[model samples]
Target: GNLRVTDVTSTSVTLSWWPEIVPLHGYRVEYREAGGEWKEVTVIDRAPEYTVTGLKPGTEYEFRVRAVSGALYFNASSVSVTTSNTQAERSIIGMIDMFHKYTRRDDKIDKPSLLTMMKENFPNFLSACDKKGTNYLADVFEKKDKNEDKKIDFSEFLSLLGDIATDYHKQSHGAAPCSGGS
Candidate 1:
C-alpha cells in the first residue's frame, strides 16, 4: 500500500494510505521517534486517513501503516516527517474549535462571540491592537465578516488569522509594523 503524510504540525500529523483489497479487519498505525522503539497506535476507524497527536516540536518521526485480514497482515513502506517549530497548523485548528464553541447558528461567529473569544484567548494581542488605534474587536469583526452577513465564517476567520500571522512575521523580521487599515 502507498503511504503518505497529509498534514503536519509541531504537535500532530495526519497520514493516509491506500486501503487493502482483501477486506481489512482494521488498520494499524505505528510511529517512533528517530532511532527509538516503535509504538503501536490503535485506529478506531477504517478510514484511509489517521491523525496522530502529542508529538514534540522540531523532532523527527517515522510512521508505518498496515492492514489486517484475518491472520494475515500487509505492511506499507515507512514514511518519515519532521515537525516544524512554528505551531501555525495547531493554532488554526484551535481557532476552528473555538469558533464552533462560540457559534450557535449556521456555524458562524457573530461580533459578540468574536469579542468573547478574543478576550478569553487573545487578550494581550487584542490589547496591543487596541492601543495602536489600528482596530478594535468590533472593527476586526466588521472587516472580517466578508459576506456582510454580520457573522464570521470559517473562511473569513482564516483570512483574519492569515493577516495576523503575516503581520507577526513582518514584525519578527524588523519590518515596518502593520498599520492595521482603518
Candidate 2:
C-alpha cells in the first residue's frame, strides 16, 4: 500500500511506489524534520526520483508521499529516513573538508580560499576576471542588487553564483553565448 524509500543521502532521497488500481494523475511528496512542519517536496505525474539539497549536516529528516487523482487523494505512504551525518560517516574527514571548501555556504566562508578554489576550477576564466576588479560575478551581483551597494548580501552572493552556474551549464552544452565581463 505504501512506497519504498531508497538511496538516502545527506541532501537527497529517492522513493518508489506502485500505481493505484486505476492509476493516478500525480503524486505529491512531503517531508520535514522531527520538529519541523511538513513541506511539499515535489509533485510529479511521471517522476520517480527527487533530490533535496541544502540540509544540515547532522540532522534527521522524515519523508512521505501521497497519490492524487483529480479531486481525490490517497492515504500517505509510510515514512522513510536517513540522518545527514551519513556523509561524515562514509567519507574521510580531510576529503570531506576539501570537498566542502567549495560546496558549503557556512558563515565562515573564506574569500581567499574561495578565490583559490575558483582559480583551480576555472583557471582561464579566473585569470581574465582577475585582470578586472569586477567581472561576471560582480556584474550578476549588481544586477540582483536593487541598491548600488558595493558589497553583496548573502542572498545576493548565492544568486550571483547561481547565475554563473546557469551560464556555465549552458556554455558546457554549447547553447549560450560565450560572453565575458568588463
Candidate 3:
C-alpha cells in the first residue's frame, strides 16, 4: 500500500517494500525529474529494494512502485524526493547566472571560451577534466548541443548544467566523475 522512500541524498534515493510471501513477478520502478522524462528500472528476483542514483540535487522527483503479479500489476502511489538540504533551487539559479556571466548579451557562448569559462569558476572541470580524456568538445558540447550550432544556448546550457549537476553530485558522493563513453 506504500511506495516509501527510505533514503535521500544530494544524488541518490532508495525505496523499499516488504518482501512478499504471496509471491510476485517483479517490481517496476520509475522516476523522473519533476516535469520531465521518465526513467525506468525493475527489481526482480525479490530484491525488495530499489536504489535510484545519479539524480540532480535540490530538485523535485516523483517515484512510484508497481507491484507485479503474474499477468497483473498493482500501482502504488507516487512519492516525491528533493535532494540537497536547502540551496537546491538557489544553487540552480546561481548556475544560470553563471552561464549568463559568460558571453553576456548573447544566446550562445563559443566553444573556444570553454577554457577560461570552466577554468575561471568551475575549476573542477579543467582539473578533474584533464583527469581524464580530452573529448570535452565532442562529448559535452557536440552531443548535448541541440541546434548543432556548436554554441551553448540557454536550453543547451540547461542540459549541460543538468548533466554536470548529477555528475558533481556523484563525484562528491564517492561515485566517480564523468565517464565519457556509451
Candidate 4:
C-alpha cells in the first residue's frame, strides 16, 4: 500500500511495501537523486522488498515501487531518503575534502602544496620517515609525480595514503610508525 524505506547506508538503500492482494506479474523499483533523472531496478520474481546500491554518501534520493500485471502498471508514491555517513564513511569524504584543502581545485597538488599537505596532515608520519639530517619525504614529490608534471594527483595521493596505512598496519604489530623495520 505504501512504499517505505527499511534500511539505508552510505552506499545502499533497502525498501519494501505491503503485498499486492491481486495476482501480479512482478514489481518495479525506481529511484534517483532527489532532483535528478529516474533509474529503474526491476524485480521480476514478485518480491516485495528491494535493495538499491551504487549510491554516494550524504546525498538525498527518492525511491518508489510499482506493481506490474500484464500491461497494467500500479504506482506507489515515492519516499525521500538521505543517505547517512558513519564515522568511517565520513572519514573517506574528509580525505577528498582535505585533498581539496591543499589544491583548492580538482587539479593535482604541486611541490609546495604537496609538501604542505604532508607537513600538515601527516606531521608525525613525516617525522617518522625523515632521516636525521635530511627530510626524506622531500624526494617523495619526484617519485609520486609519475608523469613529471611535478604535481601529485588524487590517484598518486592514494599511493601515499596506502604507504602510510601500510606503515601504520605494521605498527599495529609493534613496528615503527611509517618506519621500515624487519
Best by TM-score: 4
Clashes (candidate 2)? 0
> Across residues 1-182, which tens digit of lDDT does each residue of candidate 1 receive?
33678899998999765532211224557789999788876564446678889999999998865433211122234678899425775555445544544554466677876777667656666777767765566568877886899878778988887877887787798755654563
Estimate the TM-score for candidate 4.
0.50
My TM-score estimates for the predictions, one after another, are 0.46, 0.36, 0.44, 0.50
| CA displacement after TM-score superposition, residue 129 of candidate 3 (Å) | 2.8
Segments in model 2 whose C-alpha atoms lie over 4 Å from true places: 20-23, 69-76, 84-182
lDDT ranking from best to worst? 4, 1, 3, 2
With candidate 4 superimposed using the best TM-score fit, by how many Å does residue 122's alpha carbon deviate from the native? 0.7
Residue 92 in model 4: lDDT: 75
Q: Which ranges of candidate 3 are over 4 A from the true structure?
A: 1-86
Model 3 residue 51 distance off true place after TM-score fit, in angstroms: 53
In TM-score terms, candidate 2 sits at 0.36
Model 2: how large is the Cα RMSD against the reference?
Answer: 17.0
lDDT of 3 at 167: 76
How well is each residue in 1-182 modelled by candidate 2, as lDDT tens digits? 23566666677666664432212224556779877788775454445455666666567777765434212122323474664336544333323222233322232223443444445544666555456544544444347554555434445445645665676787798743434442
Clashes of 3: 1
